[PDB]
Design a protein around this nucleic acid. Structure first.
Ligand code: ATP
Ligand code: MG
Ligand code: MG
Ligand code: ZN
Length: 351
DNA sequence: AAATTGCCGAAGACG
DNA sequence: CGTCTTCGGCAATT
């Protein structure tokens, strides 16, 4: 039954090919423009992130996330209040994005958006436009007709090679699952900041940046087993990724018909299952034969997070994604009832 | 330093 | 299942 649903959610190679060919052409062209002399962004490198590249995109290859990352050496961080996630950036070029001593996310991003705008109107062979700007959002979204509709979020990110901000010190609790060498290695990789503004201190503090761990999350998806051979050709398949797909599908459907579930996103589901993977590390607990019950354990845990109004950011424990701020209580109760109904009625929404 | 290429894992297709 | 193919990611290469 859930196996029936997964077959339906499974992407088609023909769709993958047509979408990727077009996506790749457009991004390569944008990345190249960014390298032109006397651009502030002359060092950016591409990093493919998110659902599609983690092989957990469902239904159709119609949304792509791409990070353009800029190495900005010698940066001082000041935590914005007590969030753990949001920061103000100072320096120890790009000398016109300033606001006193503060590197403005808004200025750096607006200029980033402007250059993408000009390049896109130069594109004649492909139907592509730039989506209306979303306040506080860090992405410049391309809208593509191939003729099928595809979205590409291009995300400017500052790369810093120093050790991670202390708010992350108790995060990434993978010691009993992926282990201590993996955790230590992952934390010597750089950290990233994206120009997503903090909505606190009404409304958006235009200078604020947000921590991003898209790279770390990507590695974990591709190295998710307690055993090194999990999902390899000389190893055993697990159902970790397929549980994630089923939970994303559920939310995605619920969001489709209830506007009151805006402000929930797939990241909430992704965060909830990373916690689950930590709680249940053994690969044997994620055997394909036990798919139904793993999904049920995920659901019960997600409800428990919903009911207690707490979902700890996997990398930043201080940061509650389900605080009273960010998401209203009633919105959580609403989602609790919908889930509880679909759970007790064999998931009719799956059709 | 910018493109080209070789390598192979993850996973879709198919029987 | 086993086998075949494509896409993505890496970095040596010139
Ligand atoms: N609210 C958030 N907090 C922290 N990181 C986020 C948040 N939203 C998105 N991200 C990062 O950006 C990436 C892309 O976000 P997006 O909303 O496209 O979801 P996704 O993981 O690609 O899943 P899907 O595209 O299938 O909804 C995520 O994988 C995540 O790492
Ligand atoms: Mg996405
Ligand atoms: Mg996105
Ligand atoms: Zn696995």
């Amino acid at each position: 039954k859930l196996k029936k649903v997964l077959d339906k959610l499974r992407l088609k190679r023909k769709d993958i090919s047509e979408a990727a060919e077009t996506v790749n052409k457009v991004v390569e062209r944008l990345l190249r423009r960014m390298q032109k002399r006397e651009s502030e962004f002359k060092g950016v490198e591409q990093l493919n992130t998110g659902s599609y590249y983690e092989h957990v995109k469902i239904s159709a290859p119609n949304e792509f996330d791409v990070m353009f990352k800029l190495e900005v050496p010698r940066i001082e961080l000041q935590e914005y209040y007590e969030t753990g996630a949001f920061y103000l950036v100072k320096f120890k070029p790009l000398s016109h994005f300033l606001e006193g001593e503060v590197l403005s996310a808004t200025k750096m991003l607006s200029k980033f958006r402007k250059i993408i705008k000009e390049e896109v109107k130069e594109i004649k062979d492909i139907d592509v436009s730039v989506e209306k700007e979303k306040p506080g959002s860090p992405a410049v979204t391309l809208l593509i007709r191939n003729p099928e509709e595809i979205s590409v979020d291009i995300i400017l990110a500052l790369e810093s090679k120093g050790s991670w901000p202390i708010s992350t010190k108790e995060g990434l609790p993978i010691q009993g699952w992926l282990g201590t060498k993996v955790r230590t290695n992952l934390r010597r990789e750089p950290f990233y900041l994206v120009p997503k503004n903090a909505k606190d201190g009404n409304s958006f503090q235009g200078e604020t940046w947000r921590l991003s761990f898209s790279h770390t999350e990507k590695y974990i998806l591709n190295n998710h087993g307690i055993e090194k051979t999990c999902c390899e050709s000389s190893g055993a398949k697990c159902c970790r990724k397929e549980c994630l797909k089923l939970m994303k599908y559920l939310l995605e459907q619920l969001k489709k018909e209830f506007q009151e579930l805006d402000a929930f996103c797939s990241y909430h589901v992704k965060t909830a299952i990373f916690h689950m993977w930590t709680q249940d590390p053994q690969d044997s607990q994620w055997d394909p034969r036990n798919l139904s019950s793993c999904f049920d354990k995920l659901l019960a845990f997600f409800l428990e997070c919903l009911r207690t109004e707490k979902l700890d950011h996997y990398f930043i424990p201080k940061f509650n994604l389900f605080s009273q701020e960010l998401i209203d209580r009633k919105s959580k109760e609403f989602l609790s009832k919908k889930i509880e109904y679909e759970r007790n009625n064999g998931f009719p929404i799956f059709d």
